[PDB]
Design a protein around this nucleic acid. Structure first.
Lengths: 126, 1048
RNA sequence: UGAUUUCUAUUUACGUUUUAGUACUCUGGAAACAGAAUCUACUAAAACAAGGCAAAAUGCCGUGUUUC
């Protein structure tokens, strides 16, 4: 990784750039664990601006029906409402360039900007 | 505000209630808005109830174990110095059947028997089968216990297979009781016991609560005795509040539905088109009581007519006529045909009630015998083994019989009878109600979605009445979809049929060469359904002539729209222009029974019948339209058509209408209420040229309201619509004018009166429902254990299951990508090498362990030198680093690892202004605890979180924000979603008039569809605003200090 | 364009986790055994929304509705 180690809690969010999904996991009950990640521009308390790649994991998203192309939208909706009502922060790693953080999310994390894209790419559906 | 003379339109959706206020005389838009709320889901209360039951089960198991412990302490078999750690309960349990046991192992045996004591009745277990039902497993185990005790079989299972626990460990209480009492009769010779000791222990071992006993004393879900149990299980009638609701499958309920079916029939014959009292009695006795499932053939044979002459019946999806079947009548008749039993309606009602509310064959037998009736003991025996009796009826038996009279002696159906009788809900005295009560909705047997939206609509009506005074007219439309899943289903089907029609149009253009087909889709589809035949002349409609000269053919409305009010495909036929011209405002039966026709009516009827038989090119609605032989000048026929195509007669709509009309009737308030059919409003909205797409926010919901309000206006402006106006209002109608042609109909309804003025409206209001409820879900379900890595972080440990499943490639992915995350990688390298060998051997397979098991019959076993290693069933691996969590390690004493739960669910956030900088502290659901009347924010946790945010003691408390509260950040108004990142002081908000997702979509923006904001030194202003249920804004005023006590 | 299931009761065997014992792995030893590791499994005993009542009791409550 091309990351930089910082003091991370006094960081102000400047511009939310992207939202990617890395894994949609079926727990083999009526629930799903959705791993996603955010790409933001942020300004440190010291003045320097970095690009934050923040990973989040939303667990126990209940969906009992088998998901199809006609169904993945509703799973995305339920994931969003479960994520809004809970706590899913894992960690944040920072970069100096937007291209470097985008490359990180692109290759080492395998993140898609569409929930449908990730569902088909990981094999949840077609 | 200032009271107005206005029409109020209501659009009740699954997540919204749109209101529109139009001036009654000037047709000008007075107001419009939407009330927005989250879609209710039965699964929320479902999970609540299931977890409550599971907690009860666990509590009662622990209490049984502790009571056995107390009994042992009583007889001094357990002391404060007893030690039972090393005792094996199976060995001790089988040894105590033949020899004296240590007091320690005797106590351990009794306790281990008390922990797992088997089934009383399989009906008590609502189960999803490890794939072999508990009843079948008990059968297997009892057949295996013919010469053994449970402990002996369990011990030989342990000694041979190494396991006792799992699916096959399902016994019944009888076998445990046998083993326990033999153990006791052996051990009483060596221990100073009592017969009271044996009786008490056996009782503790086998006793449990019944379905009719319920929870113990002090429970809000319990009851005092069996009478209160029955009365709480049934509930009370809406119209006769001291009567209890009937069971669903009572005999009189089935007879009521059957008479409703019979009164709906329209028989073409020389005699009365409607079945008469003697005829209905003959049909009930000779067909419904002789055939379990009556068919149209049998009914037609009973009245000596043919099947095609009977119309107006319910239908399956296979197209077969459907009629109510007397369930309990034929269930008892198959056991006994005695007239004293099956021809006693009240006796069959009692039998149905007993079969429904009792869940045991023995209790059913006892309660049947306790009916001092003429049923024999063997008849009761046979009846106790019946199945399928569930559900409670809407009505009491009293109302059922009261309406049974009207069903027998009139030809009205249930809807017409209820509309004529106009029964008043009496569970709440509408006489002393200052506004429309919302508690009556809680009684209705309805989906929670429609329940919530009905309550919201009632409160919107109350607020509108308080603001603008009593309305002149109220018009209501309820959404067709029952939930979001149904909405997605309908969207998918509509997209499918649009795709298919586009394909057919495109290949028509390809074959014929002309793009004209792009603008003739309706005529082309009608041509397809009719197989290129003009249904009034039966001449051929060449597709080339239709595509070249489309005005040679016209879309005629089968039943004239002046009476039918039907604008759908079911009331349309592509005919020759001259046929439509000569037909006029008549029906096919009237036009083809005339001098103006070119063919007979019977030729047309034969053609229509054979065309309806094949491939569903005719809908049943269309067929009963074409063969409508009644005089549509009769007022009854016009009332029927208005009730079908203009009124919403769904049960939920009828219940809400009854409640509203009753409240207005009782208080002598002259407010005319009607519920419009959604097909008619769709027609109106289309002809008024509203866009098909709804992509500009919630205002559409208000728009629709105004639309139907506008529609209501029409029905008051023209006297020739009076009949319709009075049928939609359910008012008894008294040289009346009438719409005489279809051109007049289109002039009345298509003319865009004030439509541009409705489209130009900009002062829409929005109300979002705020959620302040404490004691929601506090933490996630999953129970995690953690490790501490070399670098000092805490990692969560995940489990990997289904290692030998055909489709599970997760272990293969993990081994190929990150082997070091497996715990066996570091702590058992030889087993990991075994696993990697297996993975590489079948690497081209999706799950190599699955193919390994199928090829070798071996699982993955732990590495062994003597190959005695255990089977590996699940694999632990390292997850993410542990962030904020709930530490539950104290529940597990001396635990080497920290035990955690994840995702602390937030409750609210309190914003303070501290020496010029805005800060906020997150109140979690775990921080709110109920104290005996009220929910209290724990002051210790609150001050802890305040200090963690470095909030001064002199900081000024600004406000508290819950879900959907209105926040004003830097002069911009959003609605609060919740805390997004507490550590980073990041909250989440959304827009008010539209979701941020669709806002971005309209501009084709690919930004993340979530508005996340930071609250820090850069924040200039933070204010709180709230609205009433109508969306009227007001800034929140006060509260120098945060709320610590909450009502709940 | 093409017709009500809410609310609620009782129970079994599972499942996740911790501790203890045993089995498996490693080291030392002739052995008796003892350590190391805590991975995989069996058995028992406990906890399973945070927690709050209540005191021998087929004991009770804790994820729903409503949020103006």
């Amino acid at each position: 990784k091309s990351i930089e180690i910082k003091d991370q809690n006094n960081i102000v969010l400047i511009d939310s750039l992207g939202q990617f999904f890395t894994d949609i996991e079926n727990d083999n009950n009526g629930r799903y664990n959705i791993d996603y990640v955010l790409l933001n521009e942020v300004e440190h308390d010291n003045g320097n601006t970095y690009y934050e790649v923040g990973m989040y994991r939303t667990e126990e998203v209940p969906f009992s029906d088998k998901v199809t192309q006609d169904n993945v939208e509703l799973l995305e909706d339920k994931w969003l409402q479960i994520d809004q009502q809970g706590e899913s922060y894992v960690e944040s790693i920072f970069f100096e360039n937007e291209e470097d953080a985008r490359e990180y999310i692109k290759l080492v994390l395998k993140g898609h900007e569409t929930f449908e894209e990730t569902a088909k790419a990981i094999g949840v559906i077609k | 505000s200032m009271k107005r003379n206005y029409i109020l339109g209501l659009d009740i959706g699954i997540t919204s209630v749109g209101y529109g206020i139009i001036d009654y005389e000037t047709r000008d838009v007075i107001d419009a808005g939407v009330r927005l709320f989250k879609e209710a889901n039965v699964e929320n209360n479902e999970g609540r109830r299931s977890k409550r039951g599971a907690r009860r089960l666990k509590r009662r198991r622990r209490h049984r174990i502790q009571r056995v412990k107390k009994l042992l302490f009583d007889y001094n078999l357990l002391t404060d110095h007893s030690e039972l750690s090393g005792i094996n309960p199976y060995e001790a349990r089988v040894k105590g059947l033949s020899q004296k046991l240590s007091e320690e192992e005797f106590s351990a045996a009794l306790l281990h028997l008390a922990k797992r004591r088997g089934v009383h009745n399989v009906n008590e277990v609502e189960e999803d089968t490890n794939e072999l039902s508990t009843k079948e497993q008990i059968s297997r185990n009892s057949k295996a216990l013919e010469e053994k005790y449970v402990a002996e079989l369990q011990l030989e299972r342990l000694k041979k297979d190494g396991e006792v626990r799992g699916s096959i460990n399902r016994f019944k209480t009888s076998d445990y009781v046998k083993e326990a009492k033999q153990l006791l009769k052996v051990q009483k010779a060596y221990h100073q016991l009592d017969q009271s000791f044996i009786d008490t222990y056996i009782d503790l071992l086998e006793t449990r609560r019944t379905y009719y006993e319920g929870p113990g004393e002090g429970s809000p879900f319990g009851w005092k005795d069996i009478k209160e149990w029955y009365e709480m299980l049934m509930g009370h009638c809406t119209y006769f509040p001291e009567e209890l609701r009937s069971v669903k499958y009572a005999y009189n309920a089935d007879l009521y539905n059957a008479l409703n079916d019979l009164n709906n029939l329209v028989i073409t014959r020389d005699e009365n088109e409607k079945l008469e009292y003697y005829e209905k009695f003959q049909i009930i006795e000779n067909v419904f009581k002789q055939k379990k499932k009556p068919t149209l053939k049998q009914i037609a044979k009973e009245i000596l007519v043919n099947e095609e002459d009977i119309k107006g019946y319910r239908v399956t999806s296979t197209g077969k006529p459907e009629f109510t079947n007397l369930k309990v009548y034929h269930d008892i008749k198959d056991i006994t045909a005695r007239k004293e039993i099956i021809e006693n309606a009240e006796l069959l009602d009692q039998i149905a009630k007993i079969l429904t509310i009792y869940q045991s064959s023995e209790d059913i037998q006892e309660e049947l015998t306790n009916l001092n009736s003429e049923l024999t003991q063997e008849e009761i025996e046979q009846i106790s083994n019946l199945k399928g009796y569930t559900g409670t009826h809407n009505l009491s038996l009293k109302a059922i019989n009261l309406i049974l009279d009207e069903l027998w002696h009139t030809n009205d159906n249930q809807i017409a009878i209820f509309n004529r009788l106009k029964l008043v809900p009496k569970k709440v005295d509408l006489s002393q109600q200052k506004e429309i009560p919302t508690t009556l909705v809680d009684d209705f047997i309805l989906s929670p979605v429609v329940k919530r939206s009905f309550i919201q609509s009632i409160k919107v009506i109350n607020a509108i009445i308080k603001k603008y005074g009593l309305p002149n007219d109220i018009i209501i439309e309820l959404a067709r979809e029952k939930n979001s899943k149904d909405a997605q289903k309908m969207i998918n089907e509509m997209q499918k049929r649009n795709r298919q029609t586009n394909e057919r149009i495109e290949e028509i253009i390809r074959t014929t060469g002309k793009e004209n087909a792009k603008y003739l889709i309706e005529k082309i589809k009608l041509h397809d359904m009719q197989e290129g035949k003009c249904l009034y002349s039966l001449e051929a409609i060449p597709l080339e002539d239709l595509l070249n000269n489309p005005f040679n053919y016209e879309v005629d409305h089968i039943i004239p729209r002046s009476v039918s009010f039907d604008n759908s495909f079911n009331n349309k036929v592509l005919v020759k222009q001259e046929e439509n011209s000569k037909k006029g405002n008549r029906t096919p039966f009237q036009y083809l029974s005339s001098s103006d026709s070119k063919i007979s009516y019977e030729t047309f009827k034969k053609h229509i019948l054979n065309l309806a038989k094949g491939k569903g090119r005719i809908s049943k609605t269309k067929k009963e339209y074409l063969l409508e032989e009644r005089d549509i000048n009769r007022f009854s026929v016009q009332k029927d058509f208005i009730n079908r195509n203009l009124v919403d007669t769904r049960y939920a709509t009828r219940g809400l209408m009854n409640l509203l009309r009753s409240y207005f009737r009782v208080n002598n308030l002259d407010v005319k209420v009607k519920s419009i059919n959604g097909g008619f409003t769709s027609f109106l909205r289309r002809k008024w040229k509203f866009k098909k797409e709804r992509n500009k926010g919630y205002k559409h919901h208000a728009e629709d309201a105004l639309i139907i309000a506008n529609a209501d206006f029409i029905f008051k402006e023209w006297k020739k619509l009076d009949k319709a106006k009075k049928v939609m209002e359910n008012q008894m109608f008294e040289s009346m004018p009438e719409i005489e042609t279809e051109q007049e109909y289109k002039e009345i309804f298509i003319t865009p009166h004030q439509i541009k003025h409705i489209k130009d409206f900009k002062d829409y209001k929005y109300s979002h429902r705020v959620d302040k409820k404490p004691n929601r879900e506090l933490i996630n379900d999953t129970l995690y254990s953690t490790r501490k890595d070399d670098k000092g972080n805490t990692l969560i440990v995940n489990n990997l299951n289904g290692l030998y499943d055909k489709d599970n490639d997760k272990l293969k992915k993990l081994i190929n990508k990150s082997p070091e995350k497996l715990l066996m990688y570091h702590h058992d390298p030889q087993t990991y090498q075994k696993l990697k060998l297996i993975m590489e051997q079948y690497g081209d397979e999706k799950n190599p362990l699955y193919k390994y098991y199928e090829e070798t019959g071996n699982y993955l076993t732990k590495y062994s030198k003597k190959d005695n290693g255990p089977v590996i069933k699940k694999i632990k691996y390292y997850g993410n680093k542990l962030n904020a969590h709930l530490d539950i390690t104290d529940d597990y004493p001396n635990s080497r690892n920290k035990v955690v739960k994840l995702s602390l669910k937030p409750y609210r956030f309190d914003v303070y202004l501290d020496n010029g900088v805005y800060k906020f502290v997150t109140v979690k659901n775990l921080d709110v605890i109920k104290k005996e009347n009220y929910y209290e924010v724990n002051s210790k946790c609150y001050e802890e979180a305040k200090k963690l945010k470095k909030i001064s003691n002199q900081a000024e408390f600004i406000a508290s924000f819950y879900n959907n509260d209105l926040i004003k950040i830097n002069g911009e108004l959003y609605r609060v979603i919740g805390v997004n990142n507490d550590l980073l002081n990041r909250i989440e908000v959304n827009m008010i008039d539209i979701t941020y997702r669709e806002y971005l979509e309209n501009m084709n923006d690919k930004r993340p569809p979530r508005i996340i904001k930071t609250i820090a030194s850069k924040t200039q202003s933070i204010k709180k605003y709230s609205t009433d249920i109508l969306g009227n804004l007001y800034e929140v005023k006060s509260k120098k200090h945060p709320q610590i006590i909450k009502k709940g």
